[PDB]
Amino acid sequence: QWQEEVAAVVVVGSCMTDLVSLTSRLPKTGETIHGHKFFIGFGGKGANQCVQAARLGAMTSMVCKVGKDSFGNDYIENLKQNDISTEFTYQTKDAATGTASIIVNNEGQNIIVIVAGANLLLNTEDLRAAANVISRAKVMVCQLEITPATSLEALTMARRSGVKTLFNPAPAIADLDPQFYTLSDVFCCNESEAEILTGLTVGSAADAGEAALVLLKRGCQVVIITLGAEGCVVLSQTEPEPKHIPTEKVKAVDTTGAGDSFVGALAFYLAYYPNLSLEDMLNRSNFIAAVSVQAAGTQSSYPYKKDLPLTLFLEHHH
């Protein structure tokens, strides 16, 4: 008898509600101003990654914790509408759904206040129920928007079952636990996160190569430093010379969430196209992220398989 594929991509990480007010000018202390418009959106790195992987066709499972509040109820509905398993999406009355409140002016300058909230209450017991699902997956994906101890335990669970680990140390912290390096099959961050992690400055592809080598020697198997619109730089234990995977300048409409589109695409390729070279996967993941920058609205900008070139889902070199 036929049955559905089990989840090949498991994401253990965050959900946040984006609360966006547009204004003419940014307020300062003591001020009340009237803005033009307000936007709510579904964000959080974990969920964003998961939504991009799902839309490419991955079978995914989101392990996370939201509030027993309207925001959390709505986030669950969002995951379902994107065909994501919520078997291990947990709700707690002990905190509100995490929030990223943003005030932004017409130039796109902003003030942002994050309250991690229920994300920080995702614990070991919560993960242990997912041990079997994790053990049958192809890729585990973590960031640093939940308790770091909880991400460390999810990478540990994956690694003990032979499951590929994709770790996005974002947002980055200067004293990152060095177990994260050892436990990461693929360690992927952006320029400013690389600076935080290494103490070096990173303003070009060459700089990112130097920073990537520092991280590699701390115990990573593959290090990728993303360069926003400019592509990425990659090195590995097998090929420690840095390689810049460049891109063509596209006209950006809204880049919010593009980093997570890149990560979620890389997760999809790692799980479903394991015989592609890493270089080929990064090329394709760069292209997909670049699709997301041509439309507004973060998750709403993430492309579906059916709208993307057929060749992204076929062999190219073999």
Q: What secondary structure letter does DSSP report for 10?
A: E
In whole angstroms, give the CA distance from residue 149 to residue 151: 6
260 included as an active-site residue? yes
Residues 104 and 22: beta-carbon distance below 8 Å: yes
Dihedral angle sign, alpha carbons of residues 230, 271, 18, 150? negative
User: Cα separation of 119 and 148, whole Å?
Assistant: 11
Judged by CB under 5 A, does residue 292 bind Na ion? yes
Is residue 189 part of the contact set for a copy of itself (CB under 8 A)?
no
Query: Which listed option, Na ion, a copy of itself, none, makes contact with residue 254 (CB within 5 to 8 Å by class)?
Result: Na ion
Binding mask 243-282 for Na ion (x = CB under 5 A): -----------x----------------------------
Does 257 appear as a known binding residue?
Answer: no
277 binds a copy of itself (CB under 8 A): no
Q: Which residue among 64, 103, 163, 212 contacts a copy of itself (CB under 8 A)?
A: 103
Q: Three-class SS of residue 301?
A: helix
Decide: is 176 part of the binding site for a copy of itself (CB under 8 A): no
**Is there a binding annotation on residue 67?**
no
Shortest Cβ distance from residue 301 to a copy of itself (Å)? 19
Q: Give the C-alpha separation, 48 to 132, whole Å.
A: 24
| 228 known member of a binding site | yes
Whole-number Cα distances in Å, 146 to 20, 41, 75, 239, 246:
22, 19, 16, 32, 32
Per the CB < 8 A criterion, the answer to whether 166 and 139 are in contact is: yes
Residues 20-79 that bind a copy of itself (CB under 8 A): 21-23, 26-40, 69-71, 74
Annotated binding residue at 207? Answer: no
- Cα torsion for 53, 58, 64, 68, to the nearest 10°? 100
Beta strands 110-115 and 37-43, pairing class: unpaired
Catalytic residues: 260
User: Which residues are part of a known binding site for ATP?
Assistant: 190, 226-231, 247, 259-260, 286
Q: Which residues are annotated as a binding site for substrate?
A: 16-18, 44-48, 145, 260
Rule CB under 8 A: which residues touch a copy of itself?
Answer: 19, 21-23, 26-40, 69-71, 74, 95-96, 99, 101, 103, 109-117
Q: Which residues bind Na ion (CB under 5 A)?
A: 254, 292, 301
